[PDB]
Design a binder for these strands. Structure first.
Length: 150
RNA sequence: UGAAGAGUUUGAUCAUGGCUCAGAUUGAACGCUGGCGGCAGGCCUAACACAUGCAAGUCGAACGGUAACAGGAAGAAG
């Protein structure tokens, strides 16, 4: 299945000793379609090449996440320095909501049922890794079943 | 009876930090402009001040009476 997404495109326009920049920086997400998620970043002269520079590392970057029935069931926080994320379970027929970064990271996890909010710096390249830090913080009833007793 | 986001410090970027916008209520008020109806609201101001009128009356099954209308009678007459 295809799940891969583009979060943001940013145009670079400053002047340097090599001349004036005409480049684009991209941020993307992919995952494995079975339990892993990841992201990638990259700058290039053309947007399809920036997207590929990002996608090729977004196809390598992985972390495993406990994703019981493709849904969130507990309240969870995530952090990266100035950027914070908070995610909670939604009701029947409700879900995302929130900034375009969280909206993409949850699709590569197969999830929709989340009430999401961001706090502090809304910076995209931090709030993405703060969302992934919040998925390191995600737990499952199937893993707690292997912890209980003894 | 349930959960955000976006504009914005620069030659850049990331923190830290304040500013801003889509929204809404009202005895509102102003201007352009205004087809029907129902329901609601309509002197917050000068606790400053009024000509005029209305707004709180009524019972004769408590009653001395009779200003009137019916009915009888009397009578001035007609």
């Amino acid at each position: 299945e295809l799940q891969e997404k583009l979060i943001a495109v940013n145009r670079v326009s400053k002047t340097v000793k090599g001349g004036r920049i005409f480049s684009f920086t991209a941020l993307t997400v992919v995952g494995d379609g079975n339990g892993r998620v990841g992201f990638g970043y990259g700058k290039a002269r053309e947007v399809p090449a920036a997207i590929q520079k990002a996608m090729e590392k977004a196809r390598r970057n992985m972390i495993n996440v406990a994703l019981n029935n493709g849904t969130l069931q507990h309240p969870v926080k995530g952090v990266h320095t100035g950027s914070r994320v908070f995610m909670q379970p939604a009701s029947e027929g409700t879900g995302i909501i929130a900034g375009g970064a969280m909206r993409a990271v949850l699709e590569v996890a197969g999830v929709h049922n989340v009430l999401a909010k961001a706090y502090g710096s809304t910076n995209p390249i931090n709030v993405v890794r703060a969302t992934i830090d919040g998925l390191e913080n995600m737990n499952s009833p199937e893993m707690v079943a292997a912890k209980r007793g003894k």
